[PDB]
Structure 1
Amino acid sequence: MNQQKSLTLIVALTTSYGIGRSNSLPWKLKKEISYFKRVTSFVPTFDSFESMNVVLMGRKTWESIPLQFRPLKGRINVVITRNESLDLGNGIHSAKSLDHALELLYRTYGSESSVQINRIFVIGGAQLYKAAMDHPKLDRIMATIIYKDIHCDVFFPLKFRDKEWSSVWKKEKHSDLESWVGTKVPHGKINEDGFDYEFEMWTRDL
């Protein structure tokens, strides 16, 4: 048991690929947070009482969510840490690597589980993003592009939107995005508190 399912990466980044500053988000986008919640939470109604999505995150990203928004609700949370000394959590799983987390979910949630897994999402940070980028099951990127050069100190590891990667990663039609996400999403740019941003979906053939 290891991988059958595809992986989906979800990120909010500037046109310079900046993803963060001083172990937090250098922007306050309340509607950007609501899209995240929605995307990472959505499960088809037919499958809504048995299934759930999984959110995989690096230990620094875990330390970043307000104590108040931990764990992410209605989703299975898995923290990747080598230094799993003692991860505190009443059913928050810890796994030492990306593949180590996949076999743990595959083990902990099989046919004999009252809880089934729908979608698997990598939600950050930079180091976990580097590992997912290299994983042979990663085929989709949900990106939020922020059209401002906001000073950042952590960058997204692969320039997926750049010409060097244009035969690999392709941006999908907005109707393709809303269908995957199962709901309707804002087309065009969104301005909220001085930042212009937009929602995109990139995919690659495995």
Structure 2
Amino acid sequence: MISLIAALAVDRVIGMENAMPWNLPADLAWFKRNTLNKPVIMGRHTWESIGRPLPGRKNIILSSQPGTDDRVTWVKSVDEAIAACGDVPEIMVIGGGRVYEQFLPKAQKLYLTHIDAEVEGDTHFPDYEPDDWESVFSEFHDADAQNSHSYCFEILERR
């Protein structure tokens, strides 16, 4: 199964200048637990935004250009990315905007964090097609002294 995971601020903003201008501890914990032990596919910008291999995951980077690092696996097309992961249960696609766009039609599951933050950003999640999906889990949290925004963790299944 192919799944996307993303955190969205209002208007589906996911990033801005090359970064994500918020610090939300609880959401990275959610990300880490839903991705560990699985292969993660990302685009080259997102690889540069993070800045090291994510531990305990097979890191697969999309780029049209030969790789710049042997600690990860470089691939040049979506089909090659899928093949590289191997016969695993679940493939996690971790962005960014251009990669999410391509993988959306294929994906069966979306792990979305809706963040109540206004944010001026230059990258969005694709607008997805409301009647495709069914929400099968959603849990809201108020801000706290560690997380400055309220947030909701939603998991959607393709109908």
Give ranges in structure 1 of 5+ residues lacking alignment: 1-5, 42-51, 111-116, 175-186
Residue equivalent to 1:125: 96
Residue equivalent to 1:179: none
User: 1:105 and 2:105 equivalent?
Assistant: no
- Does the 8 Å CA contact 2:6/2:113 hold for their aligned counterparts? yes
- For residues 35-61 of structure 1, the C-alpha deviation after alignment (integer angstroms, 9 at most, x for no partner) is 1111111xxxxxxxxxx3100000000
User: 1:145 and 2:105 equivalent?
Assistant: no
- Does the 8 Å CA contact 2:109/2:156 hold for their aligned counterparts? yes
- Greater Rg over alpha carbons, structure: 1
Residue equivalent to 1:166: 130
User: 1:203 and 2:147 equivalent?
Assistant: no
Query: What percentage of residue pairs aligned between the two structures are identical?
Result: 31
Q: Supply the AA of the counterpart residue of 2:41.
A: L
Q: Which whole-Å CA distance do the structure 2 matches of 1:148 and 1:105 have between them? A: 34
Equivalent of 1:155, from 124, 133, 148? 124
Structure 1 outlier segments of 4+, above 4 Å: none
Residue equivalent to 1:76: 58
Give the alignment's TM-score, normalised by structure 1: 0.71
Give ranges in structure 2 of 5+ residues lacking alignment: none
Q: 1:61 to 1:21 in 2, by over 3 A?
A: same
Q: 1:83 to 1:201 in 2, by over 3 A?
A: same
Residue equivalent to 1:44: none
Equivalent of 2:41, from 56, 59, 65? 56
User: 1:37 and 2:39 equivalent?
Assistant: no
Equivalent of 1:188, from 120, 140, 144? 140
Equivalent of 1:87, from 49, 59, 68? 68
